């Protein structure tokens with residue numbers, strides 16, 4: 001039952017990283033399209049990434065939720081590892097952010113809610129993403145979210161500069177509140193069109209993060225602003241959603257989510273992005 005590279009018609013490259021390439025592939029026997037993550041074993045071994053790639057596969061195996069990528073199969077030849085993943089026809093969220101400039105209130109609320117429910121599921125399994133951002137949040141043919149990129153994910157017993165939490169720059173310590181921080185950055189970015197902390201280089205961005213140096217544009221939705229101010233908290237113990245703040249209940253009960261039906265989000269028809 002183990003699939004082979006010969007079982008597929010490989011097509012365009014969807015994405016490229018340091019340790020992997022993601023390529024569109026049509027399975028010949030079924031006509032099914034998969035997004036196959038291809039990883040060179042030699043490069044992984046040379047850079048000591050074996051624990052990372054092992055963990056990534058193990059994390060993805062545990063995922064059984066509509067707002068996350070699914071791992072359908074794995075195989076390998078002499079050179080390469082192949083992970084068969086969900087194909088998300090509409091690509092990254094970042095692409096839509098840049099195309100329409102910024103989301104209105106309805107689209108912000110709906111897509112924020114989908115990320116919240118996804119994180120609720122993820123954190124309830126004791127798994128932490130650690131690199132949450134619009135580039136890693138895909139959209140399927142129905143325009144529902146599909147979170148991907150589990151290469152730096154952590155299972156409990158630095159990600160991208162702009163979405164890095166203060167505690168990560170202090171104690172070098174990562175937990176659930178790091179994801180919730182990144183959530184606050186994403187909400188801001190959906191409403192404003194750009195992430196909250198921006199500077200000339202990485203050092204200057206890190207400076208702004210630890211000082212909490214960011215401004216809301218005047219037109220920012222008041223209830224969205226109020227939510228962002230409760231996620232972008234320097235003390236990781238005081239952020240909405242975290243265990244010390246009594247979890248996801250209070251987060252979901254925030255006035256910004258007033259009209260949200262949380263129980264069936266993935267079967268609701270997504271609002272048009274205009």
Ligand SMILES: COc1cc2ncc3c(N)nc(-c4cncc(OC[C@@H](N)Cc5ccccc5)c4)cc3c2cc1OC
Nearest residue numbers: 014015016017020022035069085086087088089091148149
């Ligand atoms: C039509 O457009 C697209 C459709 C797609 N469908 C399914 C996907 C899937 N299951 N996983 C990934 C994915 C898997 N590992 C890591 C990832 O990191 C994204 C970035 N940090 C940079 C990057 C890319 C590739 C490898 C490593 C890092 C992404 C991407 C896609 C995907 C991407 C598409 O366009 C970009």
